[PDB]
């Protein structure tokens, strides 16, 4: 499936987690910022690649990145 990576410029505003339509991302504690949290991508086998997560990141350049890769039935959005 696709690959989703999270970098350390995260500020923990939880927008990407709310924008995901497939329940791929989640938030974990992390003492590297004011909010004391950072995002994570543990279920990338369900990612479809719509890149709604990147439209919500407010940093100068995205702290969440999606790289398209081998495509399966789940990542193609096929119901037949």
């Amino acid at each position: 499936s696709h690959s989703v990576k999270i970098y350390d410029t995260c500020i923990g505003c939880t927008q990407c987690v709310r924008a995901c339509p497939t329940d791929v991302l989640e938030m974990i504690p992390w003492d590297g910022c004011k909010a004391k949290q950072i995002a994570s991508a543990p279920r990338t086998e369900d990612c479809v690649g719509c890149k709604r997560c990147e439209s919500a990141c407010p940093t100068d350049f995205l702290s969440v990145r999606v790289y398209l890769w081998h495509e399966t039935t789940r990542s193609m959005g096929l119901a037949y």
């Binding site: 719509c50 990542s75 959005g77």
Partner: protein
């Protein structure tokens, strides 16, 4: 219908478009004003105007039905049963309408291609024509005979038929010109009617698919929340470009333009070749093009050579005369039509990067505007292209028709 403005607008637009098309059809065959039938320039211009108006209004009806479905639909407070049942089997409606388009397209265009190939191979006895293989429109001829014979039997109070198009009447001449006479129907009229049917069905398919799948589909279950006018939903699922209802209307405009153009060409050639003309003192009718529609309008080469090539010599020779404005508008419209293709074929990132370099060069000289330049949005780039496309095509046809018919 009392709490929504878009549903009423859609209904009224559809009805008005159909009425305008009917008005255009009913005025060339039963001329209501004096000295109109024998003045050919006005007759050709009044038929083409209202057809385009009707097509545009119909597309607007489809667009506003889609808008109502996206915005005002409410199954909780405004539940209606029939709409729900139509929405619960939309897969069967679209798949059957998809099949009809393929069948009609094959059995209407493959006949033209078969005729063209048989003509090219030196086998004129194997074409679909009045001399080799006849496909006669029997139902229309039966209707014509019935309407011709209706006065005196089924209409005792009528002294003559309603129109002179039904075969059986007499020729009418005003000032040495031909006003109206019976219009024959043959194999050439069998194919073009099915062309019309095929194009109308394809346009209906596009618009109805957009309206039905405006709310949601199997690909994007939450398409209603994204809005009526949004570009895409990202490159996921293989690509979701142009999934909104606005893009369906944008696609349907092209097919409406394609469908209407064939109608006006059919009208122009059929009337120039079979009705309009002049009458000598002894009663011999000489048509403008001498009745070449029957044999030349069965192959694609006939429309390119006998219609487009032969009838365009008037506009391209208008330089130096009082009709030179038409010659100038003929060339200008090609420029707009070809200019539209830059927006339709290209994307947004390339132009943003080009504008970035331009902005650097401006910053180098302290002439950088405080309003940062931005390239057009994805939706705007589509809207600009189709506008120029339609403008160029319609202006070209307008100049061609007006320069041709005024001279002859």
């Amino acid at each position: 219908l009392t709490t929504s403005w878009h549903a009423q607008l859609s209904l009224n637009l559809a009805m008005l478009g159909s009425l305008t098309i009917i008005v255009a059809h009913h005025m060339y065959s039963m001329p209501p004003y004096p000295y109109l039938a024998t003045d050919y320039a006005t007759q050709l211009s009044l038929f083409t105007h209202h057809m385009w108006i009707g097509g545009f209004l119909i597309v607007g009806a489809a667009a506003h039905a889609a808008i109502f479905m996206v915005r005002d639909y409410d199954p909780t407070n405004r539940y209606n049963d029939l709409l729900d049942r139509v929405l619960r089997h939309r897969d069967a409606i679209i798949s059957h309408l998809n099949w009809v388009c393929i069948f009609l397209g094959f059995h209407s265009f493959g006949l033209y291609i078969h005729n063209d190939t048989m003509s090219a191979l030196g086998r004129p006895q194997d074409m679909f024509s009045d001399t080799a293989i006849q496909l006669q429109p029997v139902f229309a001829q039966w209707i014509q005979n019935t309407h011709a014979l209706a006065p005196g039997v089924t209409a005792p109070g009528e002294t003559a038929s309603t129109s002179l198009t039904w075969g059986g009447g007499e020729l009418v001449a005003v000032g040495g010109k031909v006003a109206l006479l019976p219009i024959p129907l043959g194999t050439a009229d069998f194919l073009v009617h099915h062309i019309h049917a095929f194009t109308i069905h394809v346009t209906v398919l596009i618009l109805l698919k957009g309206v039905l799948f405006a709310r949601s589909s199997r690909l994007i279950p939450d398409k209603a929340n994204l809005g009526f006018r949004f570009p895409c939903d990202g490159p996921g699922r293989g690509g979701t470009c142009q999934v909104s209802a606005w893009d369906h209307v944008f696609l349907g405009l092209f097919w409406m333009y394609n469908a209407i153009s064939v109608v006006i060409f059919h009208f122009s050639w059929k009337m120039q070749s079979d009705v309009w003309g002049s009458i000598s003192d002894q009663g011999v009718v000489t048509h403008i093009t001498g009745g070449n529609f029957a044999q030349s309008s069965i192959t694609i080469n006939g429309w390119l050579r006998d219609f487009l090539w032969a009838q365009a010599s008037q506009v391209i020779q208008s330089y130096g005369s009082s009709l030179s404005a038409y010659g100038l508008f003929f060339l200008g419209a090609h420029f707009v039509w070809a200019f539209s293709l830059m927006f339709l074929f290209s994307g947004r990132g390339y132009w943003q990067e080009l504008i970035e370099s331009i902005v650097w060069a401006h910053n180098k000289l302290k002439v950088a505007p405080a309003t940062q330049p931005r390239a057009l949005s994805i939706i705007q780039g589509r809207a600009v292209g189709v506008t120029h496309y339609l403008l160029g095509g319609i202006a070209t046809t307008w100049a061609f028709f007006l320069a041709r018919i005024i001279a002859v």
